[PDB]
Amino acid sequence: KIGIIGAMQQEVAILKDLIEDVQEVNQAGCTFYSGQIQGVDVVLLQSGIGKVSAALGTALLISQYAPDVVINTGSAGGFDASLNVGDVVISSEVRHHDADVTAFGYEIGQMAGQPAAFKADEKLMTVAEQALAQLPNTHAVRGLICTGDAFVCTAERQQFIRQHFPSVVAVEMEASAIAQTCHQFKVPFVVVRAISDVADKESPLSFEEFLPLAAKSSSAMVLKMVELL
Amino acid sequence: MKIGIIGAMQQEVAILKDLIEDVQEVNQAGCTFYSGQIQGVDVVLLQSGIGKVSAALGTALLISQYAPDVVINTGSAGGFDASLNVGDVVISSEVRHHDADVTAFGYEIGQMAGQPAAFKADEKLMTVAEQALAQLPNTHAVRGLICTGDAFVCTAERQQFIRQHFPSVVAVEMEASAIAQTCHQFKVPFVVVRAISDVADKESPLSFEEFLPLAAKSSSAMVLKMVELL
Numbered sequence: 229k230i231g232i233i234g235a236m237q238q239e240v241a242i243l244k245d246l247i248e249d250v251q252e253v254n255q256a257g258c259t260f261y262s263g264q265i266q267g268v269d270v271v272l273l274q275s276g277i278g279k280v281s282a283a284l285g286t287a288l289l290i291s292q293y294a295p296d297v298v299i300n301t302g303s304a305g306g307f308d309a310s311l312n313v314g315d316v317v318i319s320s321e322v323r324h325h326d327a328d329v330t331a332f333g334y335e336i337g338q339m340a341g342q343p344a345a346f347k348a349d350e351k352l353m354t355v356a357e358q359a360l361a362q363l364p365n366t367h368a369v370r371g372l373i374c375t376g377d378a379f380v381c382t383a384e385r386q387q388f389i390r391q392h393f394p395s396v397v398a399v400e401m402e403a404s405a406i407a408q409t410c411h412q413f414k415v416p417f418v419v420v421r422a423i424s425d426v427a428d429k430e431s432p433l434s435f436e437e438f439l440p441l442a443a444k445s446s447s448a449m450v451l452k453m454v455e456l457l
Numbered sequence: 458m459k460i461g462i463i464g465a466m467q468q469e470v471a472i473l474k475d476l477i478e479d480v481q482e483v484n485q486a487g488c489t490f491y492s493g494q495i496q497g498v499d500v501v502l503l504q505s506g507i508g509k510v511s512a513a514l515g516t517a518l519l520i521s522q523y524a525p526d527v528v529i530n531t532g533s534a535g536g537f538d539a540s541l542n543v544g545d546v547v548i549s550s551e552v553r554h555h556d557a558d559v560t561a562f563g564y565e566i567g568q569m570a571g572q573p574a575a576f577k578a579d580e581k582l583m584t585v586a587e588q589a590l591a592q593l594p595n596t597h598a599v600r601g602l603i604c605t606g607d608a609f610v611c612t613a614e615r616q617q618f619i620r621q622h623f624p625s626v627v628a629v630e631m632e633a634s635a636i637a638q639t640c641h642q643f644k645v646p647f648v649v650v651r652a653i654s655d656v657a658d659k660e661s662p663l664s665f666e667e668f669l670p671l672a673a674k675s676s677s678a679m680v681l682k683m684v685e686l687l
């Protein structure tokens with residue numbers, strides 16, 4: 229069973245209308261779509277936006293459907309210099325960019341009672357790298373993904389994040405909530421999203437224009453990965 | 458009739474835990490659920506763990522699996538209102554994310570996309586708290602806005618940021634908005650009833666360390682009465 233999570237309707241629509249014998253179960257503002265994608269047991273969660281919605285949705289997902297693995301799909305704000313819109317970002321690890329409990333010796337981005345970072349599953353990162361070889365013309369970057377309850381689009385916020393997380397390749401608003409929840413459940417996860425913007429003055433309109441591409445690019449990556457297990 | 462009670466830390470849940478009769482304990486997802494009774498009232502006490510993600514996850518589990526009728530958030534807090542000293546009680550009229558920012562998309566500061574700007578506490582629960590306070594002379598209380606973020610607040614800069622965007626903040630902590638938002642999504646009534654352990658400045662780490670026991674005692678007495686009245 230493959231657990232698949234996206235925040236927005238737009239991020240989950242391409243996978244939703246590809247599963248067969250769909251059983252739509254919407255509860256607590258989440259929608260769960262369960263069935264089969266070419267013979268593989270899936271469950272697509274539409275979580276809604278942000279860290280709290282994602283955690284709540286992921287908690288309901290794992291406790292009631294017990295997937296074997298979790299894949300986080302959708303858009304992202306690019307930080308890596310090589311990323312253009314449509315490009316894929318794969319998580320090596322996930323951090324809260326907006327967690328700060330340093331007053332008690334925790335390193336920046338580390339939440340009390342948690343690891344500094346949540347590490348993507350080694351198999352799943354391997355499986356995403358194989359899926360990438362199936363899409364010859366898509367460029368991809370593997371690295372740190374940072375999440376916060378903010379849409380990043382100002383010089384000053386971008387600068388804050390680059391400072392504390394030099395290695396960030398990309399930014400979004402649900403991944404660390406998904407990862408932390410998976411960590412606490414001991415479920416393997418990977419994040420595989422695509423770039424809609426580069427987190428600056430222009431990202432609102434770039435996101436506007438390029439979310440469809442981002443969801444196409446991301447959903448193609450996930451469609452592959454599904455088969456590869 | 459069933460009361461959900463949520464604290465983040467062991468220290469914050471210990472007092473109420475020792476009062477549950479015929480306790481049954483579950484250890485799921487790094488959460489722990491204490492179900493049973495306190496003076497005849499069916500309750501379920503959750504120790505969520507710290508921060509917004511833990512709080513949300515725990516609350517989702519709590520509601521989906523135990524269907525409580527109301528939720529009460531208990532524990533410590535950082536005081537922002539000037540009339541507040543350590544051990545004083547804070548009761549939410551509403552809860553907001555002080556660290557949410559989607560203003561790029563037409564939302565007001567602290568409002569998450571797809572969410573209300575603020576999560577309003579249940580009127581009946583506010584009332585019950587007010588009556589519970591009427592029992593505890595010599596505890597000063599303040600009803601008002603509670604702000605949540607994934608940060609312990611202890612610099613003048615954070616404090617300024619927060620007062621500038623949420624002028625009416627009475628208090629600050631790290632779980633309430635996560636609980637309030639998941640309650641909203643589940644359509645379950647909530648109230649935050651916490652007590653002050655610090656004043657969110659340079660001194661708050663040691664202050665917190667020193668007065669977390671007091672705030673737990675202060676907050677726990679409030680919730681005990683409320684259980685009684687419910």
Ligand SMILES: CCCCSC[C@H]1CN(Cc2c[nH]c3c(N)ncnc23)C[C@@H]1O
Binds near residue numbers: 378400
């Ligand atoms: C009016 C609708 C509100 C849109 S809020 C942004 C969406 C898109 N998701 C990823 C995402 C792309 N670009 C980003 C950026 N610059 N910062 C942070 N996250 C992102 C996260 C969140 O689910």
Ligand SMILES: CCCCSC[C@H]1CN(Cc2c[nH]c3c(N)ncnc23)C[C@@H]1O
Binds near residue numbers: 332656
């Ligand atoms: C020792 C482990 C790490 C402790 S992190 C602080 C705890 C206490 N809770 C309430 C809390 C009191 N004072 C506060 C302040 N100044 N800022 C924000 N939250 C608070 C929130 C969080 O669960």
